[PDB]
């Protein structure tokens, strides 16, 4: 399963 | 910068004359990911050639593994033509039962 | 033995043609099980491993939604980064991003990874303390910084120490016919004269899973490795790897040359020579 939230921020 | 292709031609299983079986080509070692490849029988394009989703190695090139049915004869020639913007004219790799 | 996970995400502009492309791919070991690819007639993440079937409809939704979201983060991520080089909007870019957990035999977590690249060459990677960041240039230390001021670390981490772990045992369990059982290479030796004095010696490994393999020639019982000519291990499409390793040889001193394969499947290496 991917990782959700924690990719939120932008670079 | 930008990383030109590795290029193999191969079968999945060993080659038997008569007896079907899958032709393989296997890109890798690119950047950037545009990339086009032809399977080809007696110097034409195969129709309908199926390929893997794009993915990469640890070193961020990518790979490809096109592939289609075919069934090799003692007569029929096999290859695998790519170009990519690292190379100015495609490149032209033959299918060799050895390697 | 050990096993791992990773995702491998690559977005990629195209100045002129649409909005950047988003693809998502998701792999156990050397088997792929799902992609996502926002280019699809009908986005949304697709399995690609009979294993990964048996998820209920809100596994599918659920990542289908990250995936969306991730697509429309990136695109953003693409333009700033744009920006951090003062590049054009002329040129086609890339970010890649590759991260997940590696587990030891004994299923507990070894390390985890998250790891992205800007046009192929590393941009940003989470150490292995999954606490503080390594920025390849002053343009990822933009990045790092804004990654440090909302405590972006300590999710990943959160991520890659807890979902990401007990997601790859449910998945080794589901799968454990195919991803808990390691294929041996079948092995073979040819010979071809290369010229009157001299013979190409080729040692062969065929239908092996995982793709880890060794595959060197020895003279004498040393190793060959200068004049060894070694092809990368390659996909066959039924899950299986290939690879083969040459050796030119004076005509007359083939049986002074030794084949040694390593892979998993093998409980002990094994020790090949041309059989005329």
Same mark, same amino acid.
């Given at each position: 399963?991917?990782?959700?939230?924690?990719?939120?921020?932008?670079? | 910068?930008? %990383?030109?292709?590795?290029?193999?031609?191969?079968?999945?299983?060993?080659?038997?004359?008569?007896?079907? @079986?899958?032709?393989?080509?296997?890109?890798?070692?690119?950047?950037?990911?545009?990339?086009?490849?032809?399977?080809?029988?007696?110097?034409?394009?195969?129709?309908?050639?199926?390929?893997?989703?794009?993915?990469?190695?640890?070193?961020?090139?990518?790979?490809?593994?096109?592939?289609?049915?075919?069934?090799?004869?003692?007569?029929?020639?096999?290859?695998?033509?790519?170009?990519?913007?690292?190379?100015?004219?495609?490149?032209?790799?033959?299918?060799?039962?050895?390697? | 033995?050990?096993?791992?996970?990773?995702?491998?995400?690559?977005?990629?502009?195209?100045?002129? %043609?649409? /909005?950047?492309?988003?693809?998502?791919?998701?792999?156990?070991?050397?088997?792929?099980?799902?992609?996502?690819?926002?280019?699809?007639?009908?986005?949304?993440?697709?399995? %690609?491993?009979?294993?990964?079937?048996?998820?209920?409809?809100?596994?599918?939704?659920?990542?289908?939604?990250?995936?969306?979201? @991730?697509?429309?983060?990136?695109?953003?991520?693409?333009?700033?980064?744009?920006?951090?080089?003062?590049?054009?909007?002329?040129?086609?870019?890339?970010?890649?991003?590759?991260?997940?957990?590696?587990?030891?035999?004994?299923? *507990?977590?070894?390390?985890?990874?998250?790891?992205?690249?800007?046009?192929?060459?590393?941009?940003?990677?989470? @150490?292995?303390?999954?606490?503080?960041?390594?920025?390849?240039?002053?343009?990822?230390?933009?990045?790092? *910084?804004?990654?440090?001021?909302?405590?972006?670390?300590?999710?990943?981490?959160?991520?890659?120490?807890?979902?990401?772990?007990?997601?790859?045992?449910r998945y080794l369990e589901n799968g454990k016919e195919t991803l808990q059982r390691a294929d041996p290479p079948k092995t073979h030796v040819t010979h071809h004269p290369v010229?009157?004095?001299?013979?190409?010696?080729?040692?062969?490994?065929?239908?092996?899973?995982?793709?880890?393999?060794?595959?060197?020639?020895?003279?004498?019982?040393?190793?060959?490795?200068?004049?060894? /000519?070694?092809?990368?291990? %390659?996909?066959?499409?039924?899950?299986?790897?290939?690879?083969?390793?040459?050796?030119?040889?004076?005509?007359?001193?083939?049986?002074?040359?030794?084949?040694?394969?390593?892979?998993?499947?093998?409980?002990?290496?094994?020790?090949?020579?041309?059989?005329?």
């Amino acid at each position: 399963h991917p990782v959700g939230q924690a990719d939120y921020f932008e670079y | 910068i930008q %990383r030109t292709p590795k290029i193999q031609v191969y079968s999945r299983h060993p080659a038997e004359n008569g007896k079907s @079986n899958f032709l393989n080509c296997y890109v890798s070692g690119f950047h950037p990911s545009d990339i086009e490849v032809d399977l080809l029988k007696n110097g034409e394009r195969i129709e309908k050639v199926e390929h893997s989703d794009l993915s990469f190695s640890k070193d961020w090139s990518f790979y490809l593994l096109y592939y289609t049915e075919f069934t090799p004869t003692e007569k029929d020639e096999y290859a695998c033509r790519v170009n990519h913007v690292t190379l100015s004219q495609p490149k032209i790799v033959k299918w060799d039962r050895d390697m | 033995g050990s096993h791992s996970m990773r995702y491998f995400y690559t977005a990629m502009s195209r100045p002129g %043609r649409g /909005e950047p492309r988003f693809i998502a791919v998701g792999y156990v070991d050397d088997t792929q099980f799902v992609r996502f690819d926002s280019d699809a007639a009908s986005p949304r993440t697709e399995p %690609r491993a009979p294993w990964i079937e048996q998820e209920g409809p809100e596994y599918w939704d659920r990542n289908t939604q990250i995936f969306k979201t @991730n697509t429309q983060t990136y695109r953003e991520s693409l333009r700033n980064l744009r920006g951090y080089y003062n590049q054009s909007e002329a040129g086609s870019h890339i970010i890649q991003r590759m991260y997940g957990c590696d587990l030891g035999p004994d299923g *507990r977590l070894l390390r985890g990874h998250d790891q992205s690249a800007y046009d192929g060459k590393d941009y940003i990677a989470l @150490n292995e303390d999954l606490s503080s960041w390594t920025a390849a240039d002053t343009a990822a230390q933009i990045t790092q *910084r804004k990654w440090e001021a909302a405590r972006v670390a300590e999710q990943r981490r959160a991520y890659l120490e807890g979902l990401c772990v007990e997601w790859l045992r449910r998945y080794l369990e589901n799968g454990k016919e195919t991803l808990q059982r390691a294929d041996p290479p079948k092995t073979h030796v040819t010979h071809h004269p290369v010229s009157d004095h001299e013979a190409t010696l080729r040692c062969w490994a065929l239908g092996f899973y995982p793709a880890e393999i060794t595959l060197t020639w020895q003279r004498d019982g040393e190793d060959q490795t200068q004049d060894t /000519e070694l092809v990368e291990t %390659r996909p066959a499409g039924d899950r299986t790897f290939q690879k083969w390793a040459a050796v030119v040889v004076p005509s007359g001193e083939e049986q002074r040359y030794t084949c040694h394969v390593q892979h998993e499947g093998l409980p002990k290496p094994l020790t090949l020579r041309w059989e005329p």
